[PDB]
Amino acid sequence: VEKNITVRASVDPKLDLLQADGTSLPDSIALTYSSASNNFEVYSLNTAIHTNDKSKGVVVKLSASPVLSNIMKPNSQIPMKVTLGGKTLNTTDTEFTVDTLNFGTSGVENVSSTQQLTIHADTQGTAPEAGNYQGIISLIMTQKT
Template structure:
């Protein structure tokens, strides 16, 4: 029995000594940087990547709203805003059913055609360090009607570009 315990203890001690080495963890960090413009929440946080619309039976989908700010490196240049594609929700279960969406930024109903937001309106004090005025980004059902049962998903892509000329 003693002859079995001594080699076992030696193995355990050697195992502990080997496990005392440092461990290296490599983490890849990425950043998507546009040095001219950004849109954040009104508190400066990153916009949520997912927003869930609630459903009211007999009525339709409830709009979702996020208060936002636009950050720019030039308070004198206007900002163009548009959608990258037609906003819609598609049924992910397999039924070819879709729900058209409407996207509003402040008072603008967004389309794929760029619309200009005046720099003097966005940055009334001329200060860009604290971002623009706070404006709601609202996504709603285009036509408020009841919807067929299903699991719907879609991507709304808002595109911001800085005007190339100072007004």
């Protein structure tokens, strides 16, 4: 036949992280460099947590510390700082209490309040070497008793 389309999906019944407007988080992001400040800008995205039950809190962590490294020479790299809900995320987990998520206040049941997601490839005022840089962020989420 003509126009064969393959459909894929990843399902996590307990938790999901979607944008405040209902769309899924972008699969990739692009940072903007500013030679005047010799540092990257802060990337901010509005996200809302979707949960199976509203009686349990959420715990968020990263699988590994994200690093933005040049593709041609990995020796040059810029650590990236990721913060969710105003608190910095790390390889050690952090807990988001149920009372601070405000489940259902947006008008949709089991949908959390808008959480500010921030990515910052912060250099210490030192210009990285010219080239193309790439990295990956692995945001983990789990319910807590």
